[PDB]
Homo-oligomer: A and B are copies of this chain.
Amino acid sequence: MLRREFGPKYTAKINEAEENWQARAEAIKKGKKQNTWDLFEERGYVKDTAGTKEHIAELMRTRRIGAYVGIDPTAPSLHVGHLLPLMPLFWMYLEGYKAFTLIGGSTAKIGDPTGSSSDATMNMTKIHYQLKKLWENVDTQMRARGYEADWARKRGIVNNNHWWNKQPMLEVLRRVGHALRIGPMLSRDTVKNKMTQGDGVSFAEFTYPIMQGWDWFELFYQQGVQMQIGGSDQYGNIISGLEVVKAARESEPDPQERKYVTPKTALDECVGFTVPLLTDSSGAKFGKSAGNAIWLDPYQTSVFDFYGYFVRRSDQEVENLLKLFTFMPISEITKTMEEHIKDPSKRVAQHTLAREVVTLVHGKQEASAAEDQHRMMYTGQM
């Protein structure tokens, strides 16, 4: 598909960015530079892919694509469980892609089927605040990890209420509703599970993945977003989302828009993947400690208790978590584990994980103070 028209000044910068991206692409082809896709694989972020690995790898190599993660504001704080899909997104941002965190302002009212507006508006506000705060810390870490400035690197926070507040139903149905079949939607475990056992599925719940697909269409249209990264349970939604985006791009009625939105080549298609489901060996969900989430908000979970959660991670899982939840180069993680196995009881690896994650969420100062506290002769049980 053709690039849209812009002014002469923006255009020059876009061309230079494309030239830079292609030098990067050739460096990857020659093996001088690791493809961010191969980084995803090496660090353990890839569970399921919508699109082949080879497809996604070559898209990532050849194009400075946009990617996104959606988050439904179902509570006033994010918790550490939310961090997992965000990490590969943050890596792409560090690498100079365009990366978006979409707040599901409208879609949280429908609710993602499993597997008051006063409060819901407050939650939206707080999630936006927290994502802005976290994105700022990503910038801090970008700078600390030696990544250079890049004009074409982009981050954003989008709320899907931007289109859902007024998006006509008729248009959605006409642009994608004829293309989407309910059999495949119904022939997916999440739907059959909730219908056979549980209290059935509402039309709104049934429609949720169509709305999430239209979200992706809106991000593709507006920001060139070709990739969705999803939580471990989002594979089905990503598959449906791809169908919705494809239908929408193929049904664009204006021939002038079709030049920009209708795919012309194989790599114009959208792609997605999901991150692993993280549990410990006792079955505990990552980010749950006792009957409680480990919140990013210090007013819900103290920094000390946030650090505590990570310092208590098992020796079995800690290397995997260093790869997933830090921006440490693999060589640095290898050296940490080398030190750690000299005497695991010292919890070198876990203190490192804690320091790195607290540093990302709460900053280096808070991280240092929390570490000091967790190295005192008494630290609680718990």
Within 8 A of B (CB), among A309-325: none
Q: How many Å from the CB of A238 to the closest CB on chain B? A: 17
A200 engages B181 (CB within 8 Å): yes
Complex CA gap A167/B200 in Å reads 27
Report which residue of A165, A173, A205 has the largest number of chain B beta carbons within 10 angstroms of its beta carbon: A173
**In the complex this chain forms, how many copies of it are found?**
2
- Chain A 107-118: CB-based contact to B (< 8 A → 1; otherwise 0): 001100000000
User: 11 A–B contact pairs at CB < 8 A?
Assistant: A164-B169, A165-B168, A167-B169, A168-B168, A178-B204, A179-B202, A181-B201, A182-B200, A182-B201, A183-B201, A203-B210
A residues lining the B interface (CB < 8 Å): 106, 109-110, 164-170, 172-174, 176-183, 185-186, 195, 200-207, 210-211
B173 engages A203 (CB within 8 Å): yes
Main secondary structure of the interface of A (DSSP, over half): helix
The chain B residue sitting closest to A117, CB to CB, is: B253
A168 engages B170 (CB within 8 Å): no
Q: How many Å from the CB of A236 to the closest CB on chain B? A: 15
Complex CA gap A159/B182 in Å reads 28
Complex CA gap A177/B210 in Å reads 14
Complex CA gap A186/B110 in Å reads 20
Knowing A168-B168, A169-B167 are in contact, say whether A203-B183 is a contact too (CB < 8 A).
Answer: no
Residues of chain B lying within 8 A (CB to CB) of residue A206 = 182
The chain B residue sitting closest to A173, CB to CB, is: B204
Complex CA gap A168/B185 in Å reads 23
Knowing A110-B177, A173-B110 are in contact, say whether A185-B203 is a contact too (CB < 8 A).
Answer: yes
Known: A182-B202, A185-B203. 8 other contacts (CB 8 A): A106-B170, A110-B173, A110-B174, A165-B170, A169-B172, A169-B211, A177-B203, A178-B202
